[PDB]
Write a protein that binds this DNA or RNA. Structure first.
Ligand SMILES: [Mg+2]
Ligand SMILES: [Mg+2]
Ligand SMILES: [Mg+2]
Ligand SMILES: [Mg+2]
Ligand SMILES: [Mg+2]
Lengths: 93, 274, 348, 113, 104, 64
RNA sequence: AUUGAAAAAAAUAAUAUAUAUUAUAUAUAUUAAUUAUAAAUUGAAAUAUGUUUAAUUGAAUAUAUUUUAGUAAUAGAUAAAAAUAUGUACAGUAAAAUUGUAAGGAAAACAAUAAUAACUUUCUC
RNA sequence: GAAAGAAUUAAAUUAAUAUAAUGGUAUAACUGUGCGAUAAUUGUAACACAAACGAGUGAAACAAGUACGUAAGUAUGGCA
């Protein structure tokens, strides 16, 4: 909510395919126009964000697929494998 | 002005007066910066911190055990010597300087459960000497710092006039940044995990480096700065990149404790230690 | 769930407005803030996301802690420890915080802020110490009211003063303020709010207004005059407004005479001091004291000797300032005082 | 009249600057302000308890260290001196890595050297 | 001789109105050489990235492991072409043929 | 030598004036001071017309 | 007031209205803004009737109006780089030397360098 | 036992002071900052210091109006 506007004008140069596709992905805000009533307040936009609300930006090359935090040892309740708890500390008894 | 004579009148009570509360001015500076009503408000704890959690879970106990010394005692530092009163001229004579130093040195306490070493801050120094001819390189260096770290950089201005180096005074030669908490944790994590492994011939940090009372400093070149994710992502916007010094300030009473702590955080060391 | 219980807990530890209570304890973000009166503004407003369930969990945590504090308080015996534990138990209550923060603390309403309750008393103490006490001490020190009248002051009660009978307007006098003769012509009323553990059924208070600036030509100096004096006054945490309703002629050791400065006699300071009488044990009922009225000077007063002789300890103070104007003659005539003197313009 | 380098650096310092990028001030109702106050008090108390639990654990560990040292000193001075020998040059193993938030493909390595 | 861009009259940021600086950052996922992933805050609009050379495949940080393959950037420069150009020779025969020189 | 003299004249049509020195190229001086004839603080401006140095107006509403 | 929705509230302050006092006070009402200021055929948005389209909807084209982009440093009552040398109010402490640190060396820039007995608030055994 | 405050003590006037040298300055007179740009205003000036004269120096107080300050108050150019 208290976050700055994204300066896309620096991360995407003029007239480039990346800039075009980023713009296509993004959804613009509502501009103020005389003769209309805006119950939530007259829009106040600078650099493409409505200042009264948060701003949402959507974005060998295979996607990142994280590994499961629970292991075969976890499910099989193996008391000897060194994987029974990847987040806890184990101690030898 | 009738006179220049500072003099504070004594009071007749023990009540502490802060005039910032009696002045109706500056209403919004009366709130603490942690108060949601303050315009200076900035959320602090937004996510967990892997490095801090690791240090609290594992390294504190190990460091305590390692640094334990049986029946240890405080080693007092070099302090100002006192004149023996064998001559009257010693009555109001200022004390003497420490034996070997012109500055006093701190005492070293035994490591105990309350004073285990830990990281307290990181400061990055970027002084572009070639900015003497071009002031815009300072802005570029500040952007490099902002992208690498994520904190607000602060400018560095020339202070001395050295002709041989053609360095004037009062000009912007670079930028600095100080990191604490999660942000320094992230910076160190990314350094160790990405940048240092990508250096050509990297053996670690010199074991004879750091101020003698806790704190380790080491540098990075421009090619080394090119390894950070932000620069690699948009190489196009980085025709030129600048190196910088990195100063890690810890709670270590002495330097070797800080070296052990950083080794715990996976910082290699190669040289022979003092 | 001790905070939901009110069998023994005072009813003031709850928000008396059902709408605000329901909004603060709401289950889903379906209601709207009662603070925002206009619907338009209510639609414009948007509460921070993910705020009610975190609030529920924080409430549960704080309430468990408060329950532990109440458990230990029910077993403690020393009254000071009992009061401290009660304060620690109810300090974090959202309802208490709401009530105190957003309701009057001076003309408090018993059902919102009850000063019989330790938590409200402690929060009031903190509020007073934040701003009011510092200003009082600054005014006393700067106007030199402390050394001139009494050696020092350790504030322990909030004293407010007003002049309701004189003009008809309502205003609590700021310390060190200049008041007109018309304003200060009739009589002041006091309000002494106490924030410490004091036995309401035994303790008695005295109030002295003195002027340590009345000129004295015998030695070319000043002297102190007892403007006003009351003794044997009993207060209560919630009923502590002194006025001719709450005292008798036996409490008056010196009827009120107004500020009547003389022309070119300087700015005079009228300082109010509140003392608490000794609290003898092994005896039932308030310990009243008789003032030696044939020894009281009333024009050559010695306040230090007075308090030393009657074993009084100051707990609060106030001050205002006065200077000559046109209405002084009228006040003198009205009170049957002789015509005022006129002093030179130059101090030689 | 400016150079393309000037424009580039002005864009960089635009990314620096806060002009035309910050949202409106966050104004909260009285009730939500009280809610937030309770959240922060709860979190502060919680973190204090966590810190104190860790501190107590370290106190107990240190007490154990000193008790063990006394016992070993009185039982066998040779082993006591071996234990009390300094570890000034000690470093941690280089694979005692800081935990990450998702595990690797090979969870554990069962061979070495 | 120095080049500088002119200073404009700084806007006055009053006492109490000075807000903090919260730059826009993304919760980006960062994959190391192994299958491990770290979440971090980045200002680049790239929510996902993988590294080819990093801590998890460096001898200095990985002393215990017996085998550790190294790799560099692909589709850049003339790398690996010194092998792709010679197919007749292929991998132990050369090791045996490099027994000794017999020179003195 | 490097400094010149100037006659500041009061705005109220009272004839009162006060004199001050100023650098050869300093900006035109105007100052509020007491005017005994009208018994109050009033403005004082230059009497004659002086060759003032030219300083650029500040870039305030951003240009180009 | 309308506008997603069934008695009214009880603080400091600010704003609007009004009237008490030879008292910068009180009553009701509400809780705005807080990084902005002209000039842009050319970059990017939001607004209608055909449209292809499935009650819609929709996504794409055309125009009228409007909005954004002039992209500029301090975000801290800033504190020994350079700039305002006279007033007032609030607040702080320099300097050398030593130890380190990419280029960096005697000399550029950053970091570290005296002691906590007593007193508070909080957490905890 | 631990955090966060309030700070206290030792040292420092060697840095800095618009400018020589001397005296003074951390309670700062040095430095940062918000208002401001106002007192770098007006009519009487006692009394002192210094002093052949002529001149010079500090300045209480009365009156008029300004700026800053919650207030106490400060400001009739610059630490001298
Ligand atoms: Mg000077
Ligand atoms: Mg000197
Ligand atoms: Mg003489
Ligand atoms: Mg003479
Ligand atoms: Mg001055």
């Amino acid at each position: 909510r208290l976050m700055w506007t994204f300066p896309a004008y620096f991360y995407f140069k003029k007239g480039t395919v990346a800039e075009h596709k980023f713009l296509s992905l993004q959804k613009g805000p509502i501009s103020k126009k005389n003769g209309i009533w805006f119950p939530r307040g007259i829009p106040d936009i600078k650099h493409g964000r409505e200042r009264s609300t948060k701003q949402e930006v959507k974005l060998v090359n295979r996607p990142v697929i994280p590994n499961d935090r629970i292991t075969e040892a976890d499910r099989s309740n193996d008391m000897k494998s060194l994987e029974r708890q990847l987040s806890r500390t184990l101690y030898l008894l | 002005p009738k006179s220049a004579c500072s003099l504070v009148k004594p009071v007749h009570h023990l009540v502490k007066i802060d005039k910032s509360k009696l002045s109706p001015r500056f209403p919004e500076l009366k709130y603490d910066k942690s108060d949601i009503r303050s315009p200076g408000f900035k959320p602090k704890d937004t996510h967990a911190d892997r490095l801090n959690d690791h240090y609290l879970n594992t390294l504190q106990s190990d460091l305590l055990l390692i640094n334990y010394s049986h029946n240890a005692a405080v080693v007092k530092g070099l302090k100002q010597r006192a004149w023996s009163g064998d001559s009257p001229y010693h009555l109001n004579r200022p004390p003497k300087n420490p034996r070997g130093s012109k500055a006093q040195l701190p005492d070293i306490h035994p490591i105990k459960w309350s004073n285990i070493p830990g990281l307290e801050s990181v400061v990055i120094n970027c002084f572009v000497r070639e900015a003497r001819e071009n002031q815009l390189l300072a802005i570029t260096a500040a952007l490099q710092l902002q992208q690498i770290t994520g904190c607000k950089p602060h400018p560095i201005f020339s202070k001395n006039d050295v002709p041989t180096w053609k360095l004037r005074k009062g000009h912007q030669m670079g930028a600095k940044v100080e990191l604490k908490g999660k942000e320094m944790s992230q910076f160190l994590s990314t350094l160790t995990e990405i940048v240092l492994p990508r250096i050509r011939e990297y053996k670690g940090i010199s074991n004879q480096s750091g101020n003698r009372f806790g704190g380790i400093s080491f540098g990075l070149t421009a090619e080394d700065i090119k390894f950070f994710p932000e620069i690699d992502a948009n190489q196009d916007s980085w025709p030129k990149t600048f190196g910088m010094h990195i100063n890690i300030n810890t709670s270590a009473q002495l330097d070797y404790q800080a070296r052990t702590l950083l080794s715990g955080f996976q910082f290699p060391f190669f040289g022979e230690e003092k | 769930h001790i905070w939901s219980d009110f069998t023994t807990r005072p009813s003031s530890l709850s928000i008396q407005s059902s709408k605000v209570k329901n909004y603060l304890f709401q289950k889903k973000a379906s209601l709207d803030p009662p603070s925002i009166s206009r619907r338009s503004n209510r639609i414009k407003y948007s509460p921070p996301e993910h705020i009610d369930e975190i609030f529920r969990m924080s409430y549960d945590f704080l309430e468990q802690r408060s329950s532990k504090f109440y458990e230990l308080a029910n077993k403690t015996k020393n009254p000071l420890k009992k009061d401290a534990l009660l304060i620690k138990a109810e300090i974090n209550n959202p309802e208490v915080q709401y009530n105190f923060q957003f309701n009057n603390k001076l003309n408090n309403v018993k059902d919102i802020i009850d000063y019989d309750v330790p938590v409200y008393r402690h929060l009031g103490k903190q509020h007073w110490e934040s701003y009011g006490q510092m200003l009082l001490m600054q005014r006393l020190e700067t106007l030199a009211a402390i050394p001139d009248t009494l050696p020092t002051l350790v504030p322990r009660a909030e004293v407010n003063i007003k002049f309701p009978f004189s003009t008809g307007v309502n205003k609590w006098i700021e310390p060190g303020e200049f008041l007109s003769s018309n304003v200060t012509s009739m009589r002041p009323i006091f309000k002494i709010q106490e924030y410490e553990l004091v036995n309401v059924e035994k303790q008695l208070y005295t109030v002295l207004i003195v002027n340590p600036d009345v000129p004295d030509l015998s030695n070319d100096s000043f002297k102190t005059a007892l403007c006003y004096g009351l003794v044997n006054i009993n207060l209560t945490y919630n009923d502590n407004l002194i006025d001719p309703r709450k005292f008798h002629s036996s409490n008056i050791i010196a009827d009120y005479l107004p500020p009547v400065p003389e022309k070119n006699a300087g700015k005079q300071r009228f300082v109010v001091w509140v003392f608490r009488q000794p609290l003898i044990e092994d005896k039932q009922g308030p310990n009243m004291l008789e003032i030696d009225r044939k020894e009281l000077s009333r024009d050559d007063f010695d306040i230090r000797q007075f308090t030393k002789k009657y074993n009084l300890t100051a707990i609060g103070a106030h001050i205002w300032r006065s200077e000559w104007d046109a209405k002084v003659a009228a006040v003198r005539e009205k009170y049957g005082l002789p015509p005022g003197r006129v002093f030179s313009r130059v101090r030689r | 009249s400016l150079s393309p380098l000037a424009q580039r650096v002005v864009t960089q310092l635009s990314v620096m600057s806060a002009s035309r990028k910050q949202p409106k001030l966050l104004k909260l109702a009285r009730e939500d302000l009280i809610k937030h106050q309770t959240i922060e008090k709860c979190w502060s108390i919680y973190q204090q308890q966590q810190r104190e639990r860790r501190n107590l654990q370290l106190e107990l560990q240190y007490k154990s260290i000193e008790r063990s040292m006394n016992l070993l000193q009185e039982l066998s001075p040779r082993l006591f001196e071996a234990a009390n020998a300094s570890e000034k040059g000690k470093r941690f193993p280089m694979e005692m890595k800081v935990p990450t938030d998702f595990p690797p493909n090979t969870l554990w390595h069962y061979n070495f050297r | 001789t120095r080049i500088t861009l002119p200073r404009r009259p700084a806007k006055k940021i009053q006492l109490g109105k000075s807000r903090p600086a919260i730059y826009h950052q993304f919760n980006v996922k960062m994959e190391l050489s192994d299958g491990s992933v770290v979440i971090r805050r980045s200002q680049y609009p790239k929510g996902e990235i993988r590294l080819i050379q990093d801590q998890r495949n460096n001898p200095l940080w990985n002393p215990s492991r017996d085998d550790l393959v190294v790799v560099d950037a692909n589709s850049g420069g003339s790398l690996d072409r010194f092998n792709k150009r010679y197919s007749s020779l292929f991998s132990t025969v050369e090791l045996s043929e490099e027994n000794k020189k017999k020179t003195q | 030598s490097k400094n010149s003299v100037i006659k500041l004249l009061s705005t109220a049509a009272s004839g009162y004036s006060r004199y001050i020195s100023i650098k050869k190229g300093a900006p035109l001086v105007t100052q509020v001071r007491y005017d005994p004839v009208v018994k109050r603080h009033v403005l004082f401006k230059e009497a004659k017309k002086r060759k003032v140095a030219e300083r650029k107006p500040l870039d305030f509403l951003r240009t180009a």
